[PDB]
Write a protein that binds this ligand. Sequence first.
Ligand SMILES: Nc1ncnc2c1ncn2[C@@H]1O[C@H](COP(=O)(O)OP(=O)(O)O)[C@@H](O)[C@H]1O
Ligand SMILES: Nc1ncnc2c1ncn2[C@@H]1O[C@H](COP(=O)(O)OP(=O)(O)O)[C@@H](O)[C@H]1O
Ligand SMILES: Nc1ncnc2c1ncn2[C@@H]1O[C@H](COP(=O)(O)OP(=O)(O)O)[C@@H](O)[C@H]1O
Ligand SMILES: Nc1ncnc2c1ncn2[C@@H]1O[C@H](COP(=O)(O)OP(=O)(O)O)[C@@H](O)[C@H]1O
Lengths: 119, 441, 439, 449, 459
Amino acid sequence: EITTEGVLRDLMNIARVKYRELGLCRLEKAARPRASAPPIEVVCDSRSAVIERENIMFHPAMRKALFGPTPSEIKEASFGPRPVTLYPPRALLPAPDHDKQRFTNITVPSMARFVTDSG
Amino acid sequence: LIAAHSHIRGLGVDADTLEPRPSSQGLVGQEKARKAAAVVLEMIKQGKIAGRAVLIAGPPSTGKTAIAMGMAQSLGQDVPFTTLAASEIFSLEMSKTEALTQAFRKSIGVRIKEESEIMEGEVVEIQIDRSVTGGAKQGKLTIKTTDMEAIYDMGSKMIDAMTKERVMAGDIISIDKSSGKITKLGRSYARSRDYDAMGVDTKFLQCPEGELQKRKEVVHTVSLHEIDVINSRTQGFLALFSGDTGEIRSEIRDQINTKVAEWKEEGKAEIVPGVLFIDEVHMLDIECFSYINRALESDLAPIVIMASNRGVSRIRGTDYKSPHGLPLDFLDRVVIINTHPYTPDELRQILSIRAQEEEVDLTPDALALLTKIGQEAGLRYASNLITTSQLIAAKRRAKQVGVEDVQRSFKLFYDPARSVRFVQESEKRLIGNDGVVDFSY
Amino acid sequence: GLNLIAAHSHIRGLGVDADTLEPRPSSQGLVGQEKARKAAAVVLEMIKQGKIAGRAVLIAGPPSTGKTAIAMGMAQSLGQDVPFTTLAASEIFSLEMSKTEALTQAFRKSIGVRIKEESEIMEGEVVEIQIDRSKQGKLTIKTTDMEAIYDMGSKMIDAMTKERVMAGDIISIDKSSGKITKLGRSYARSRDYDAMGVDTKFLQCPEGELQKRKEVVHTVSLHEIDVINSRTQGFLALFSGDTGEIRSEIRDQINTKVAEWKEEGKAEIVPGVLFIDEVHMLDIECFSYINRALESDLAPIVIMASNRGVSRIRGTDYKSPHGLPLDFLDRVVIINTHPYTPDELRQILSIRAQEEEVDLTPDALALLTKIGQEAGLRYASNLITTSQLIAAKRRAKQVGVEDVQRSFKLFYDPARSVRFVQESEKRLIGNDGVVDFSY
Amino acid sequence: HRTAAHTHIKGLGLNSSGIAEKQAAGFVGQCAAREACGVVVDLIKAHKMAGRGVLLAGGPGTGKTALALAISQELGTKIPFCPITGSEIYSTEVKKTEVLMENFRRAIGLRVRETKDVYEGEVTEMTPEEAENPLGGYGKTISTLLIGLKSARGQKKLRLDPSIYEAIQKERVQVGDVIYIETNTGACKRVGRSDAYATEFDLEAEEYVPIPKGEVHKKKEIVQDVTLHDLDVANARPQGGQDIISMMGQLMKPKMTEITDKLRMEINKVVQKYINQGVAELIPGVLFIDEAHMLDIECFTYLNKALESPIAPIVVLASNRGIATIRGADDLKAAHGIPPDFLQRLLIIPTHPYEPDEIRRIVRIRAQTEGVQLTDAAVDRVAEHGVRISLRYCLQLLAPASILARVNGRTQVDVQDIAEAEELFLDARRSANILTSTGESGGLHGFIS
Amino acid sequence: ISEVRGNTRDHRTAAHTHIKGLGLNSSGIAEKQAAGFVGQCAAREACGVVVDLIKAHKMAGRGVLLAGGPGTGKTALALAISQELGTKIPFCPITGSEIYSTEVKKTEVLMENFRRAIGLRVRETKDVYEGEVTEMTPEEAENPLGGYGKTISTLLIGLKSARGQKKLRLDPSIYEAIQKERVQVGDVIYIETNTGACKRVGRSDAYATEFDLEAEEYVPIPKGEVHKKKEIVQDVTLHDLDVANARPQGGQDIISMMGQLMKPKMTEITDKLRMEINKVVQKYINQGVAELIPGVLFIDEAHMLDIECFTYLNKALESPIAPIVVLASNRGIATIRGADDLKAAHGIPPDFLQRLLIIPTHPYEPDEIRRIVRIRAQTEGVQLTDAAVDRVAEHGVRISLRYCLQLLAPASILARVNGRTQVDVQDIAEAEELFLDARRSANILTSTGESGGLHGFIS
Ligand SMILES: Nc1ncnc2c1ncn2[C@@H]1O[C@H](COP(=O)(O)OP(=O)(O)O)[C@@H](O)[C@H]1O
Ligand SMILES: Nc1ncnc2c1ncn2[C@@H]1O[C@H](COP(=O)(O)OP(=O)(O)O)[C@@H](O)[C@H]1O
Ligand SMILES: Nc1ncnc2c1ncn2[C@@H]1O[C@H](COP(=O)(O)OP(=O)(O)O)[C@@H](O)[C@H]1O
Ligand SMILES: Nc1ncnc2c1ncn2[C@@H]1O[C@H](COP(=O)(O)OP(=O)(O)O)[C@@H](O)[C@H]1O
C-alpha cells in the first residue's frame, strides 16, 4: 500500500482490474429470474406476531448498519463541540458489482434497441 | 523460461495447400496428422461447423500435445483455446457435468463492441467539498487543452478516483467517462515546491491539443461462461476468477443463449467459436461421455480436440475395455487422427530444435549419441540429457557439449527402461505390491 | 464431583525409582510389566530432556495387558509441565478436514510455547464517577481494604460510557491494553433492585490492593497459535472446532516467529507427547504422512499402542504385523507388554477394589483372581463393582464368595458369551441374515 | 448460420392424416416412429393427460435424438420442451431426486397476465423525516421520506414507507433524477437524469432522459411466461421484497436447495387461484431425458412416484442399449437398460437401422444443409462409408472434404477429396485395428493399456 | 513486561539434523564422506546437477525421481538439495497424502503447492515521514476565500523520531486524515508520499503518565530517521498472488467483514486467473522490477498420488512458469493408486515416468553404516566406546540402519543413570532389549498369537 511504485499492489488487484476492463460491470444483463417473490410469512392472529414480524423481517439494527447514519446524526456529529462516534461509522452495504443494474432486476429500454428492433 | 513445447510456434503447414513441410515452425514429421490438424484449423477459423470431436491418438510422445499446441499457436489471441486435463472435471464444488458445461462455454467467445468517450487535458483547477463526519462529497474539475477549457462537475466516485490518483493542478490526465477510469500521463510544469511529501516527480508532457472530448470504439471478448457467471448473480462476480460458481441453473443458460443470438442479430456482438482441448481424455468416466454425446449437438458447441495414449483399455466407471479407453457410442461421433513413432532422422531434427531452443551447443558427436539414446530410451529422456549435459559441460568450463558430457549424463540419470531393470534387480529391498520388504544387508 | 471412578483412576504414575529408572514391582498403581515400564521410563527421560525430536514408540501386546495403563502412567508422571495429547485413531477421520490436516493439528497440540509475563491490573468496586462536561473526569474505586480516586483521560470516559459503568459495578482495567471489563455487581448491591437483568452477576468485592501486579507463566501450544491466526477472531474456533484446513503458509510463519521468540529468550519451546491409541485404525495415507511428520525439528515424541496380530492394513488389502506398514515400523521402536501371572492379577484386583472402595473377603479375592485368570482381567475387574451391588442387596458389609458367584452367573464373560452364540446359531441372525423365530 | 448435427431436422414431416411422408421436413424413413411421435405430439397439444411416458428405443445413430428434436419443433415455442441427459441428474448441491423434480417443473408452463401498479416522474423534491429512538442502541431511524414526482401531465408528493426509502437509497436517487417505483415489490429504478439538466459538463456518463409522459401514477398490463419451477425457486430463495431477508439473499452466493413438497403443493394452490381468477392458463409440456440408461434404480424408483403426480409433464426417454445391467442395481439386467418395473409404464417407439438408399438420401440432405456441393460419384462414395462403417462417420466427412476440395481450388467435392478425407480422418474401427496391431509391441512405442 | 529467559537456547535434533549439504567438490564430484553424508556418491552427484539446474533458472517443469528402497537416503538427499539452494529459493515439501483435501478437488491442492514452489522477488522504494507529532499549526492564506470563516494555505506538523525533528509543511488537505484518524500532539503517525495522507499508530509512551487511567495502549517513538526513504525487497509465491486475488482481504463492507470472521475455506481457483496473473507477472519481469525465483516442489511418498494427480501433473509441468518437481518413491512394482488393474515400476504411471530424470539410491555397506553411526552419535551428542560403535553398526547391518541409529538416545540415558557419560556395550545390550525392532516384534506376534481365544493378539 505504501511503496511509491505499486508493483505488488497492482499484482494483488489483477482480478478486479481485469473484471472492469472487460466491461462486465456495464454490459447489459443477459438473464434475470423469471419470477420473484417476497419471503413467506407466518399468519397468526396475535399482535405479538405482528410485532415480531417487524422486529425480525424488518430488523432495525441490521437495516441501520446497512444504510448508515441518519441526516440528524450527521449534523449532531458534525456541529458538536467534541467528536462523537456513530453506531456504524458508515453504510456497510457493499457496492454493487454491476454499475447500472445495482440491486434490482428492473430493466429500461434504450435507443440501441429502438433503432434495431425495426428492420 | 523454456518449457516442453516452447519451440512449437505454429503447425508448420503451407497456408495455401495445407501441405506439411517436413520441418517448419518447430514441428517435425507427423505429416498426415499435421495435415489433418491443418484441415481442422480451417473448420475452426471458418466457424460454421459446430461440435466436431477430433481425437488425436498415438503411443506416448509422438507429439499429440505438440500438434494441439501448434494449433493454439496458429489460431492466435482472439480465438478461445481452453485446455483441460480430463482430471480437472472431477470436483467438489460442482458435478462433472457442470464442470464440462463450464469448459464448453469457456470455449465460445462473444466479441462485444462499445463506443466510449475519453477526456484528456491539463488540470487547471480542482475543487472538492467534503462533509464533516459523513460521506457527502461534491467537486469541480477545470481542465484544458491548447484549444479548449471547461469546468466539469464531479460526483463522489470521481472524487474518490481523483484523490486515489492524487490529481493536482498541472497534471495531464485522461478520463474514460464510460468506465470512470482516471489515469495521469505527466505534468505541464514542475511539481510546486512549497509543500512537503508531495510524491515522486512525473514525466514531463506538453499540453494536449484539440477538443477535450473524443469518441473511441473499444472491443471486448468474453466467454459465454463469463456471461453465465455475471448473470446468475446479483453480487459476487469474483466467482469469475475464484471458481466458487456453484452449479449454475439451466434456465439462466437458456436466457443467455437466446440473448446472445439476439445480440448477434442486433449487431451488438460477434460470436467467436473456439476449441476445447481435452488432454488424456480416457480419464473421463462413462457419465462424462454420455453428457458430451449431446453437449456436442448444440449450435453453440465448440470444436472439441482430444488426445489419448491408450490401447484397448478399461473405461472408467465401467467393467469393460474399449479402444482408446473410450466407449463406442462416443467414438461413433469422433474422427481419429493418428500419430506415429519417429524415425532416427526425425529424432535428430527434434533434438536439434530442442537444443536450439534451450540455447545448448551440441557437438555433432554428442548429437549422434543423443540420437542413438533417443532411439533406445525415448525422445523425452534424450531431451532431458541435453539440459543435463549443458550443466555438466559448464561445470568443467567446456565451450560445447561433448560425448563426455552426454555419457556422464547418461551415467548419472537412468532412463525408464534401465530404471525398470533396477527395480527388477532389487525386488526384495523395494516394497512390493503386497508390502513386504527386507531392510537388512 | 465430576471425576467419577474410571478404569484407570488408580494409575497415579509410572512407579519407577526415578534416579535409576528401575521399576518397583507394585507402586503408584502399576503392577508388573517391569520391562515395559522401564522402557516407558527411558522414554520419559527423552521427553523431559526434550532434545530428541520425533521418535515413535509403539506399545504392543494382547488386550488387557496394560498398554493404556502404561501410557496413562506416563501422563501422570510427566505432569502438567509438558503437553500430553491423547488421540484415538478414529478421531482423525473428520468431515471438517483432511486426515493429514487432522494429524497436523494433533502434532502441533503436543508442542508448547511458554512465556512468562508481568501483568498490571486494577480491579475494584466503583464508588462514583465524576465528569467535567465543560473532557476530563475522576473515578472513585474501592477494595475491601483500600480506596482511591483516579484521574480519567477522555478515552477512558468514552469507554466507561460505552460499557455503561455505574456505582456498585466491579470493574477491571488492564493497564497494558487500557481496556475495561465489567465483571459484575457487588453482593452489597443485591438490595438495589426488585428485578434483575438476565446478564447480571453478583460478586464479592475485590480484596487487597487495587493496582495488583503479578508474575504469570503461560503455556500455549503451536496448534492454538495456528487457530488464533487462521481468521480474525480465530480464538473462537479453539472451542467450536471449525478450523478448516489451515493454510500451510500460516503455519510456516508461526514456526518462524516462535523460533525468533526462542532466539530472543522471549519464550521457550516445550516439546511434549502425542499418544495415538489404537493406531491400527489409521490408514496407509495417514502412515505416509506420519513418516514425514516425525522427521521434523518441531515434532513431538509420538507414542502409540496396538493389539493387532498380523492384520490387514486399512486402505489396502495386504496384511502386516500390528496392522502397520513395514515402511512405518522401520521408524518405530517397539515395547511389548505381556499377560499377567495370578499374583499380578491378585494385586491389580486389590488395587481396583481399593479404588472402588470395596471390601473383598480373602476368599472373594481368591475366587475373583481365578476368574481373572480363566476369563480375563477386565471381566474380573467388572465383577468387583457388580459384587458390591449384590452384597448391598443383602445389606452385607463385605463382598463374600456368594456375591462373586452370583455376579459370575448373572454376567457372562466373553468366552461364555461366544459359546452361547454358537449354541444359539439358528435363533441369532447370521452373517447371511437367516434366522428362525419359531420355538 | 452455425450448423450442428440436427440442423436439417425441421419437423416430423407428417400428413394431416398423421401418416409420414417418406422424405419430409429433413427426415428420411423412420416412418413408423415418426407417426408414433406424431401421436405423442398430439397427446401433448391436447394438454389433458399428466405423466405419460414414452421410450425411444433403438441403436446409436438411428435418429432417436432427431425425433425428440422434431417433437420440439412440432410443439413450437409456446410449450415447454425440457431436454436433459441422464448424466445431468447427479448434482453435488442437492439429491438426485431434486433435479428430477426441478426438470419436471421446468416442463410445466404458465402464461399469466400481471398488473404493474407503478409511479414515475422527475424527482422535484426529496425530504426525510426522523424517529428519535431512545434505547434501541442503533441510534436514530428514518420514519418516512416525502418525495415529489413530476411527469409531463401532473405531479404528486409521496410519503414513502422506510422500506421504500431504503430501495431509493440503494438506487442512489437525487433531486432531478427520473425514477420508477413498482408498488408490487416496492422496488425503485433510477431511469436517469432529467433532460432539463442535459449538459456535457459532468465527468460521469449520465443517462439524460426526458420527463415521463402521461400521469405520474400508472397501471401497466404485462403478459409473462413462467414455469412452475420459476415459482418454486422464487419462493424458496426470496429476493423480491425490501425486507432484510430479501436484501441479504441478494448478497449471498446462489445455492440450490432440496425444495420441499410442501412448497410445491402450496404453489399449486397459488397457480390454481391465478387460473380461477382467469389471469393465467396452464401450458403443460414435456421432459426429454436423453441417455436415460445413465439414470439409476433410485431415479427410476422416484419416477414411479413423480409420474403419478396429477400435473406431471409428458416424459420422453431415449435409450440405445440391449440387455444391460441397471445402474445402482448391479445384479439386475433388463432390456433398454431400464428396470422391468418401470418399463411397464412406457409406450415404446422402436427405431430401426437405415437401408443403403436411405443413407444416400440423408447424405444429400446433409450436404445441402452444410452448404457443400458433391458429384454423384462423391455422394455414392460417402454413402458407401455410411453403409460399411456408420452414418455418423460418413456425415462427418463432408466438412473435411469440402475444405480439401477448396484447397485445390475446386468448388465441388469429388471422389478424390473424399478419398483424402478417408485417409486423414479415420473411423473407430480402423483406429481400433492400429491399436490392436501395434499392441503386440511393448516398450517405448506401445499404446498404454 | 515479558520476563526474558537467559540461561540456554540450544537446538533439538531430528532424523536428518546431520545433513548439511551434498558434500561435493568444486568439480561437482562427491567426497566419500562430507557434509554429513556417507556414500550415495552417484546419487549425490546427480542431485548436484539438479541443484545446478534449479539454480540456473533456465528451465521450467522438469521432473526428477529419487528411486530406491526405504532408508536409502532419499529424503536426506531432498533436504540436502534444499540446503544447497538456501532459503531464498522456495522449497515446498509435501507427501502425496497431503493432496486429498476435503475443501477442494485434489488437483487444486496440487496446483496450490505447485505455485507455492514458485517465488517472485519485487523491489520497491518505501517513502514515509514518521514520528510523534510535536506540533500542528495552520497557516492562513494571503488570499482568503469569500464567505468562509478561515482559509488555510499550509498545515505544519512537527515530527520527532528518536533520531531527529522536522517541520513538515504539508498541503492543507491533510486536515481530512487528522480529523478521521483523530491525530493529537504526542501521537505517533506516518505520512506516506504516494497518498499524502497519514495514519495513526498510537499515542507515544512518552505520554504514558498523562492520566491515572486512559483507554489506549502506548507505543514507542520510532527509532528510525524522521524521513524514511529506502528500497524494500518483497518475496511472494505466485500462490500468494492467487489467494490475494481470489480472496481479497481489505474489504470494508458487511459481506467482506462477515467473510473474514468465518472459516476461510480454499476454493478451486480458475486457470483464467492464474493465466492473467502469469501474464502481468511477466510484464513486470520484462520491465525488470520483479525477478522470478523457480523453486522445488518435493513430493514425498509420490506413490500416494493417484493417476488423476499424475495426469494433471502432465499439464502442470508443461506450463511455462513452473517449479522443478522432485518425486521420491520406494514401491518397486506396484498398483497405481487410482487404477486397480495397472501395475508399474515405482508405482508411477509409465506415461508419466518417461518425463522424469531418475536417480537411484542403493543400499549401504557395513562400513558406511558404521560411519553413519558415528556421525549420528556426534550429532545427538552421544559419546561411545568403539566396541559400542561396532555393536550398534552390527544392528545396522543385521536389522536396519534406522533401528540402530534409534538406539543411541535410549542407550545414552541408560548410561547416565549408571553415572557414565560414555555409552558402552552394556548399555547397547540393554537398549536393544528394552526396545525391539520390527522383526523381533513380528516373531512375538507369530509365536504368542498362535491362538486368539484369550491372552492372544487380535487377528
Ligand atoms: N513432431 C515433433 N516436433 C517437434 N517436437 C516434438 C514432436 N513430437 C514431440 N515433440 C516434443 O517432445 C516432447 C514430447 O511430445 P508430447 O507432445 O509431449 O507427446 P504426447 O503425445 O505424449 O503429449 C514435447 O516436448 C514435444 O515438444
Ligand atoms: N499393570 C497394571 N497395573 C494396574 N492396573 C492395570 C495394569 N494393567 C492393566 N490394568 C487395568 O486393567 C484394565 C485393562 O488394561 P488396559 O491397559 O486398559 O488394557 P489394554 O492393554 O488393552 O490397553 C484397565 O482398567 C487398567 O487400568
Ligand atoms: N431419418 C433421418 N433423416 C435425416 N437425418 C437423420 C435421420 N436419422 C438420423 N439422422 C441424423 O444422423 C445423426 C444420428 O442420429 P441421432 O439422432 O444422433 O442418433 P441417436 O439415436 O444415437 O440419437 C444425426 O446427425 C441426425 O441428425
Ligand atoms: N548417506 C547418508 N549419510 C548419512 N545419513 C544418512 C544417509 N542416508 C540415510 N541417512 C539417514 O538414515 C535415515 C534413513 O534415510 P532416509 O532419507 O530417511 O531414507 P528414505 O528417505 O529413503 O526412506 C535418516 O535418518 C537419514 O538421515
